[PDB]
Amino acid sequence: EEVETFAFQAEIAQLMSLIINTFYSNKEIFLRELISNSSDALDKIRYESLTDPSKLDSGKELHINLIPNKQDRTLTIVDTGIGMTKADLINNLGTIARSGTKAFMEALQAGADISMIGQFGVGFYSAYLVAEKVTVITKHNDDEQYAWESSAGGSFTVRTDTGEPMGRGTKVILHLKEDQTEYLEERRIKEIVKKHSQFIGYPITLFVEKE
Ligand SMILES: CCNC(=O)c1nnn(-c2cc(C(C)C)c(O)cc2O)c1-c1ccc(CNCC2CCCCC2)cc1
């Protein structure tokens, strides 16, 4: 019930600027990066389940779901990956923004393609192209469920979460910007998944809204 607040102990500003000046014309990249993040976490639980199958006591189905919500202007991406402990959450959303931005900027000068963003540990922040705010709910076997949240300003919060428990994995909720509601369209999400994520080795399921 207690909220901790962290300062972006680098320039998340530098990262955000790089991302605008690199993908603002092709915002749809965010879905590719988020889906790819899920796949990595999914690989991790799969791998770990081999040495020790009780790892899957928290859930057997290894998959990714997309869930637009036009009423709430949210697009949510759920996976049953290995999830994140507190430390992993901070590490992956804080510590690695710093070193990852740096590493990526250096490679971009040396001439690397922008499509490499994922490999430098910062693909998640491409969500700030479409979303004013992002919430990340996550659960790892070796820890409690946590909610991370940030508007990409100078800070993010981490709190123990108390809403519906997932058993293992990560849900990213994007509160879209007024002008970016197109990513709530079934047709659009379809194009994107086909265009970017056809070779993801796990089922990606779009949950269509009734209307
Ligand atoms: C301690 C082990 N747990 C995890 O690794 C994990 N668990 N869930 N996720 C995860 C994270 C995100 C972002 C919020 C960071 C996500 O959108 C979906 C996820 O499943 C992650 C996760 C953590 C980090 C990353 C980023 N990997 C970038 C890396 C860079 C070097 C090349 C290979 C790939 C992707 C997913």
Author numbering: 15 to 225
Please share excerpts from the published article on this structure.
Heat shock protein 90 (Hsp90) is the most abundant ATP-dependent molecular chaperone that plays a key role in the folding, stabilization, and function of a wide variety of client proteins within the cell. Hsp90 is a functional homodimer composed of two identical subunits, each one consisting of three domains: the N-terminal (NTD), for ATP- and drug-binding and a co-chaperone interacting motif, the middle (MD), for client and co-chaperone binding, and the C-terminal (CTD) domain, for constitutive dimerization as well as co-chaperone and client interaction. Indeed, this domain is structured as a two-layer sandwich, formed by a β-sheet on one side and a cluster of α-helices on the other, delimiting the ATP-binding pocket, a flat-bottomed cone of about 15 Å in depth. In fact, molecules targeting the active site behave as Hsp90 inhibitors by competing with ATP and preventing its hydrolysis.
In all complexes, the residue in position 112, being lysine in hHsp90-NTD, arginine in K112R, and alanine in K112A, points outside the catalytic cavity, thus is not involved in ligand binding within the active site. The peculiar network of interactions is conserved in each hHsp90-NTD variant and observed both in the substrate and in other ligands and/or inhibitors. To further elucidate the contribution of residue 112 on the ligand binding, the only non-conserved residue between the catalytic pocket of human and parasite proteins, we also solved the crystal structures of our ligand in complex with K112R and K112A variants, structurally characterized in a previous work. These findings show that the scaffold of JMC31 may not be directly exploited to develop protozoan-selective inhibitors as it fails to force the protein in its fully open conformation, in which Lys112/Arg97 point towards the active site.
